[PDB]
Design an enzyme around this catalytic site. Sequence first.
Site, PDB file in Angstrom:
ATOM      1  N   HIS A  61      36.573  43.857  30.119  1.00 17.72           N
ATOM      2  CA  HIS A  61      36.762  43.151  31.397  1.00 17.72           C
ATOM      3  C   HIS A  61      35.562  43.338  32.319  1.00 17.72           C
ATOM      4  CE1 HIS A  61      40.845  42.664  30.043  1.00 17.72           C
ATOM      5  NE2 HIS A  61      41.047  43.969  30.052  1.00 17.72           N
ATOM      6  N   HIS A  91      32.420  50.143  38.847  1.00 12.46           N
ATOM      7  CA  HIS A  91      32.200  48.977  38.012  1.00 12.46           C
ATOM      8  C   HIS A  91      31.814  47.827  38.925  1.00 12.46           C
ATOM      9  CE1 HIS A  91      36.377  48.642  39.372  1.00 12.46           C
ATOM     10  NE2 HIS A  91      36.088  47.352  39.438  1.00 12.46           N
ATOM     11  N   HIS A  93      31.957  43.275  39.446  1.00 13.01           N
ATOM     12  CA  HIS A  93      32.385  41.924  39.090  1.00 13.01           C
ATOM     13  C   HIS A  93      31.207  41.012  39.390  1.00 13.01           C
ATOM     14  CE1 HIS A  93      36.637  43.346  39.057  1.00 13.01           C
ATOM     15  NE2 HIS A  93      36.134  44.177  39.954  1.00 13.01           N
ATOM     16  N   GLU A 103      34.412  39.261  44.571  1.00 11.26           N
ATOM     17  CA  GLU A 103      35.856  39.095  44.660  1.00 11.26           C
ATOM     18  C   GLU A 103      36.215  38.856  46.123  1.00 11.26           C
ATOM     19  OE1 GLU A 103      37.588  42.356  42.162  1.00 11.26           O
ATOM     20  OE2 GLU A 103      37.844  40.564  40.899  1.00 11.26           O
ATOM     21  N   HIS A 116      32.481  48.089  42.892  1.00 11.84           N
ATOM     22  CA  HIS A 116      33.698  48.810  43.259  1.00 11.84           C
ATOM     23  C   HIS A 116      33.586  50.268  42.853  1.00 11.84           C
ATOM     24  CE1 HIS A 116      36.170  44.846  43.239  1.00 11.84           C
ATOM     25  NE2 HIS A 116      35.480  45.020  44.356  1.00 11.84           N
ATOM     26  N   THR A 195      42.453  44.520  41.753  1.00  5.65           N
ATOM     27  CA  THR A 195      42.151  43.095  41.606  1.00  5.65           C
ATOM     28  C   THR A 195      42.273  42.608  40.156  1.00  5.65           C
ATOM     29  OG1 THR A 195      39.795  43.385  41.241  1.00  5.65           O
ATOM     30  CG2 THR A 195      40.552  43.209  43.562  1.00  5.65           C
TER      31      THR A 195
HETATM   32  C1  TG5 Z   1      38.010  56.650  33.698  1.00  6.01           C
HETATM   33  C2  TG5 Z   1      38.120  55.277  34.350  1.00  6.01           C
HETATM   34  C3  TG5 Z   1      39.606  54.838  34.378  1.00  6.01           C
HETATM   35  C4  TG5 Z   1      39.822  53.814  35.497  1.00  6.01           C
HETATM   36  N1  TG5 Z   1      41.172  53.313  35.414  1.00  6.01           N
HETATM   37  C5  TG5 Z   1      41.356  52.293  36.438  1.00  6.01           C
HETATM   38  C6  TG5 Z   1      42.169  51.119  35.865  1.00  6.01           C
HETATM   39  O1  TG5 Z   1      42.833  51.334  34.862  1.00  6.01           O
HETATM   40  N2  TG5 Z   1      42.190  49.787  36.409  1.00  6.01           N
HETATM   41  C7  TG5 Z   1      41.530  49.244  37.539  1.00  6.01           C
HETATM   42  C8  TG5 Z   1      41.745  47.894  37.811  1.00  6.01           C
HETATM   43  C9  TG5 Z   1      41.132  47.303  38.894  1.00  6.01           C
HETATM   44  C10 TG5 Z   1      40.298  48.058  39.732  1.00  6.01           C
HETATM   45  S1  TG5 Z   1      39.497  47.295  41.127  1.00  6.01           S
HETATM   46  N3  TG5 Z   1      38.782  45.942  40.565  1.00  6.01           N
HETATM   47  O2  TG5 Z   1      40.484  47.007  42.129  1.00  6.01           O
HETATM   48  O3  TG5 Z   1      38.552  48.228  41.667  1.00  6.01           O
HETATM   49  C11 TG5 Z   1      40.065  49.402  39.464  1.00  6.01           C
HETATM   50  C12 TG5 Z   1      40.688  49.982  38.381  1.00  6.01           C
HETATM   51 ZN    ZN Z   2      36.902  45.953  40.634  1.00 12.62          ZN
END
Ligand code: TG5
Ligand code: ZN
Length: 257
Positions: A61, A91, A93, A103, A116, A195
Amino acid sequence: HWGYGKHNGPEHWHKDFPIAKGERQSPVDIDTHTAKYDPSLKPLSVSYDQATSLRILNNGHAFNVEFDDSQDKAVLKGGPLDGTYRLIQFHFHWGSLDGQGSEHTVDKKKYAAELHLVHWNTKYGDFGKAVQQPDGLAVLGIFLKVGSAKPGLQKVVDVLDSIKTKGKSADFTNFDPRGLLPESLDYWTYPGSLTTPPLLECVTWIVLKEPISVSSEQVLKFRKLNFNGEGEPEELMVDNWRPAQPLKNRQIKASFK
Ligand SMILES: CCCCNCC(=O)Nc1ccc(S(N)(=O)=O)cc1
Ligand SMILES: [Zn+2]
Ligand code: NA
């Protein structure tokens, strides 16, 4: 099997994740004229000097740079927050074109990408518990525009060749996330959600007013990543952003006049 394509993208997510149509979904458009200055908002405290990066992962993703969050090493405090939030990963987007990819939007303007930095509230013990709480996460969002290179981003760009496809990871130790920040920590803040699925309504969003600049070459290398696994048909990892969601019963607050 959610994703960002025509048949599994943001318009479809609600069927498996009904909270997609919830009361505090992210991202949102930040209407700068309607956001209200809150003089009681404290300055952000970003304490990243002891940050311990470990690994970078293509999860199909986006790509995540992961940190050691088993101690208070890189933490976010202050601002709208009560308590201590530990950095677990960051990460991005981004778009297929320089005029889309973020976003959050600002007066409906889209940036080329959005960073983010994801933190979780240490009073909940671990990330999995934190995402089940309305104040479980704090995500620091930073806009990227295309212009001059961001020197602190280049080590990230350099390693992307080694994690081209879904499920690939690489060692990524000794990375300093302070090199990804703009000069100013002026911000907007509002209660929102993840998100991506599962779209849990657990995030205090803190979105910096000042974008960082990255070069066209840096963002081009983001766009060479793949959504797919190795040996599968190639699908470029681009346009992995959710569009702005209804603000509903929320006010965006500004730390600055
Ligand atoms: C070791 C890393 C595990 C992270 N796990 C996080 C996870 O599973 N999902 C996640 C989804 C969206 C966002 S966002 N786009 O709102 O920032 C951040 C994290
Ligand atoms: Zn994000
Ligand atoms: Na350029």
